[PDB]
Structure formats: C-alpha cells, structure tokens
Design a protein around this nucleic acid. Structure first.
Ligand SMILES: Nc1nc(=O)[nH]cc1C(=O)O
Length: 196
DNA sequence: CAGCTCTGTACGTGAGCAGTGGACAGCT
DNA sequence: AGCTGTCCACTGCTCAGTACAGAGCTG
C-alpha cells in the first residue's frame, strides 16, 4: 500500500495527460503506474530514470522531478501522454486489445495537437503503434528516429528505451541518456531547419 | 526447409523497505 | 556501574521492459 492507500484504489484513479499545441516534444508513455496515479504526476517513481536522464542530457538543464511536469510545456515545450490511459502496474499486465484501442486514441491526440517530435518511451509501444497505424511491422526494429511520420501531419516519431528501471539491458540512467541527447540534437535541428 | 508469429523465460542496477544491532545518553 | 530506552547506521532483501530461444504456424 502507498501511505495507506490500496492498490485497488489506485487502479481506479487516472493520470491526466498534459498537452498543448505548438509543442517541440511529446513524451508518450506505456500506461501510468501506481506511483504515477498516486502522485498525479508523470514519472514519479524512485527508479525511473526519466527525470535523471532529462537532466544529464541537458534538456531540462536543471535537476527536476515529477512535481514540475506541468511547467514543462511552457518552459521546455515538453508534453506528456500515454499509449494506454488506464492505470496499470506493469507492461505484461496489458492485453493486445487495450494497446490497439490506445493506439487509436493516441494517434488521434497526436494528429490533433501535432507536435514536432512524438517521443515513444518504450520498445514495445511503438512496435504495436507502427503495426497498427502504419501497417508496417519491421523485423529488427531499432531505437531513435523512425522512417514514418504520423499520418497527415509533420510530426516525427522517435523511440527510446523505457525510462522504467525494470529493463535489464539498460541497467542505469547513464545507459539511457544517450537517446535523450540525440533527441535534443533532433529538436535543435528541427528548429534550425525551420528558421532557415 | 524457411520464415513468421506467439509464448515463456531470464536478465543489472540502485532506491527504498523492514528488521537488526551497536552506539549512547538519561536514569538510579 | 548497571539498566533501559531512542536513534540511526547498516543489513538483506524486493522491485521498477526487453531480447531471444523455441514451439507452432504458414508459404
Ligand atoms: N511512459 C511511461 N509511463 C508509465 O506510467 N510507465 C512506464 C512508461 C515508460 O515505460 O515509458
């Protein structure tokens, strides 16, 4: 239990997406966790490396945490959303129907606000997104920039390893910070190419 | 065969938890 | 000195997606 709050109570709770227009980066999660639903703020968890990697990459340029998430769209042009709106404990707890339902809702949100870069935050959520939305399932899928824009917009797709600490292949935030940096370079490159 | 999909299985760090015990001040 | 308590340093845990092998497909 979290400070006396049952897990069943957290499952009923939802984590509201923080979204505006003209955003440089929208961070797409898998689906909000217990700690995330509890705090009412994105990427609380003690481990998750999100806020650590955000600082180490120089994106935030100051060390922040989940409570500053609402100030991100204004200052840093960074938004938040999820593949699945439902509050879930882990990824293995999600079915295929839920992912694809969330896939439709996600792409509709993405083609609504239309940011510069739509950043997936996992391996798996883009695998399903690419198969569902683009109808393209590629063997040996890779991280980083993707060949396909979301339909009828200019928004690029960028894939990163999940900021969750459950991932053994990327044990430390030092391992995942590499993609955050390249994301920053992509953002600066889109701004410079636009002003040209 | 060859390739593709599906299921299950195993894998590292470092933050936080409860339990443990040593340090140690306040007593008499 | 002897006893008893709090406090905290420290312990041993457990816990927050991804790659891949192999069974079961289909061409
Ligand atoms: N973006 C996320 N949000 C969550 O609530 N859990 C996990 C992720 C993730 O793996 O990116």
């Amino acid at each position: 239990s979290f400070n006396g709050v049952s897990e069943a109570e957290l499952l009923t709770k939802t984590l509201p997406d923080i979204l505006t227009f003209n955003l440089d980066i929208v961070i797409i999660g898998i689906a909000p966790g217990l700690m995330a639903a509890y705090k009412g703020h994105h990427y609380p968890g003690p481990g998750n490396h999100f806020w650590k990697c955000l600082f180490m990459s120089g994106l935030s340029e100051v060390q922040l945490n989940h409570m500053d998430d609402h100030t991100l769209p204004g200052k840093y042009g960074i938004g938040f959303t999820n593949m699945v709106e439902r509050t879930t404990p882990g990824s293995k707890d999600l079915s295929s129907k839920e992912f694809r339902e969330g896939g439709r809702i996600l792409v509709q949100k993405l083609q609504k606000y239309q940011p510069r870069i739509a950043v997936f935050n996992g391996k798996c959520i883009y695998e399903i997104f690419s198969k569902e939305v683009f109808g393209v399932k590629v063997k040996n899928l890779e991280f980083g920039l993707q060949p396909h824009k979301i339909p009828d917009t200019e928004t690029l797709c960028y894939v990163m390893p999940s900021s969750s600490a459950r991932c053994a292949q990327f044990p430390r935030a030092q391992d995942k910070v590499h993609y955050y940096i390249k994301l920053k370079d992509l953002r600066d490159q889109l701004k410079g190419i636009e002003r040209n």
